[PDB]
Amino acid sequence: TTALVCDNGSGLVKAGFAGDDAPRAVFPSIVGRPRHQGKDSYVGDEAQSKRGILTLKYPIEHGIITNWDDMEKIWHHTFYNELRVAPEEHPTLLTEAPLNPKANREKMTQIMFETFNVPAMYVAIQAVLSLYASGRTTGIVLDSGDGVTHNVPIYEGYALPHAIMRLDLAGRDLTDYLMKILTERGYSFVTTAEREIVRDIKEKLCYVALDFENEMATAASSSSLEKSYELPDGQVITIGNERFRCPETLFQPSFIGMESAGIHETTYNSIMKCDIDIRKDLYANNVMSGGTTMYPGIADRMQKEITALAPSTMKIKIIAPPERKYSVWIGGSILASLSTFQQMWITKQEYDEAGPSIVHRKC
Numbered sequence: 554t555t556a557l558v559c560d561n562g563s564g565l566v567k568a569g570f571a572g573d574d575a576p577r578a579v580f581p582s583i584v585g586r587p588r589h590q591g592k593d594s595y596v597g598d599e600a601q602s603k604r605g606i607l608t609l610k611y612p613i614e615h616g617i618i619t620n621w622d623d624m625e626k627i628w629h630h631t632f633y634n635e636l637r638v639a640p641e642e643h644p645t646l647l648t649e650a651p652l653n654p655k656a657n658r659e660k661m662t663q664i665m666f667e668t669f670n671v672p673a674m675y676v677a678i679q680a681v682l683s684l685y686a687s688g689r690t691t692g693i694v695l696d697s698g699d700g701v702t703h704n705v706p707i708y709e710g711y712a713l714p715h716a717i718m719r720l721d722l723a724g725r726d727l728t729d730y731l732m733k734i735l736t737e738r739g740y741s742f743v744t745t746a747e748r749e750i751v752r753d754i755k756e757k758l759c760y761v762a763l764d765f766e767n768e769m770a771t772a773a774s775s776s777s778l779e780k781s782y783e784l785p786d787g788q789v790i791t792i793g794n795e796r797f798r799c800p801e802t803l804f805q806p807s808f809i810g811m812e813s814a815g816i817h818e819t820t821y822n823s824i825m826k827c828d829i830d831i832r833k834d835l836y837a838n839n840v841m842s843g844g845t846t847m848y849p850g851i852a853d854r855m856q857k858e859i860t861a862l863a864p865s866t867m868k869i870k871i872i873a874p875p876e877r878k879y880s881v882w883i884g885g886s887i888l889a890s891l892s893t894f895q896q897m898w899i900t901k902q903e904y905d906e907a908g909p910s911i912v913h914r915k916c
């Protein structure tokens with residue numbers, strides 16, 4: 554009687570039942586296999602734990618299920634042992650990436666059915682659900698996850714294909730920068746195990762600089778904005794610079810040898826690429842979702858950043874909910890449990906007559 558909502562991210566899967574206030578599961582989005590030709594698998598955590606004897610791969614690169622057979626594993630694990638449920642008797646909601654390919658979708662679809670024999674299923678735009686979980690039916694989202702960040706302006710519930718912005722800069726690239734400028738402040742973080750740390754150092758300490766400059770040399774001639782962080786065991790390396798400098802990369806891709814424009818930029822471009830009737834609103838309903846959109850004051854930074862690039866008579870709104878980190882899943886949750894939605898599901902039958910193409914016709 555309960556359907557499922559699996560939000561496939563590049564870094565983390567989020568899964569759960571249609572109706573819970575939060576994803577019952579949220580595990581590493583990796584898959585470990587032995588070493589070679591001769592227990593051929595291990596998803597999420599099992600894989601990390603037993604890493605020492607398997608080589609780990611992420612099956613989703615920048616929002617895209619690129620490693621397929623590995624994914625099937627992942628799904629099987631999510632169901633049968635992350636939810637401990639029978640796919641055959643549970644309708645399934647799958648998150649999807651903006652501009653995700655017809656194929657990459659028809660595949661996903663195919664799978665659920667042919668492989669898992671789910672009863673009915675559906676694929677939804679991440680930013681969209683995410684948006685729906687904030688009230689708005691129309692607006693423009695900023696989804697900066699782990700492997701990518703997008704920009705989606707949506708109209709009365711419809712993402713504006715033409716006007717979408719894909720920025721391959723996200724959490725990891727971001728951690729990587731951190732664990733770079735941290736080996737250069739006199740350390741050595743290079744192995745992946747240091748990453749997960751420099752990463753936790755990230756999630757935790759570092760933040761959003763309002764005025765990059767006055768907040769650069771603000772603590773550049775002071776310790777007042779410094780902090781301590783105990784190493785994996787004992788040490789207390791201090792942070793100062795690396796803090797707002799890490800995220801800052803989101804507003805300044807240069808820092809990574811990235812030619813692309815920063816957030817507020819792409820956000821603007823996007824409104825601007827949207828027929829004028831709506832922008833007024835777009836400016837007004839600017840939603841933030843995604844782990845990396847979790848830094849502090851990034852909220853404000855954007856307020857500023859934007860207004861600066863927009864009509865000095867635009868009512869500009871920033872909406873950065875606390876639940877961001879799972880925004881999507883929830884949206885999926887709600888949308889999934891909706892009566893009327895019950896007609897949106899794509900039953901096997903439907904799928905049996907017409908093919909996997911049946912999915913594209915949405916909402």
Ligand SMILES: Nc1ncnc2c1ncn2[C@@H]1O[C@H](COP(=O)(O)OP(=O)(O)OP(=O)(O)O)[C@@H](O)[C@H]1O
Nearest residue numbers: 562563564565698699700701724843844845847848
């Ligand atoms: N407070 C925080 N500040 C900065 N980054 C954070 C914070 N909390 C979590 N993150 C980062 O957000 C990322 C996880 O975000 P999220 O779950 O939205 O990504 P995903 O959905 O798995 O991947 P995708 O990019 O495909 O959407 C990690 O890179 C993590 O370090």
Ligand SMILES: C/C1=C/C(=O)O[C@@H]2C[C@@H](CC[C@H](C)/C=C\C=C\CC1)O[C@@](O)([C@@H]1CSC(=O)N1)C2
Nearest residue numbers: 564565581582583601699724725728748749752
């Ligand atoms: C608490 C946690 C949060 C998170 O966001 O995890 C995601 C998923 C994680 C999986 C790979 C690692 C080795 C194995 C197990 C991890 C378990 C929990 C990780 O790889 C990330 O860390 C990468 C690496 S560094 C970064 O910025 N993204 C993001």
Ligand SMILES: [Mg+2]
Nearest residue numbers: 561562563698
């Ligand atoms: Mg995601």
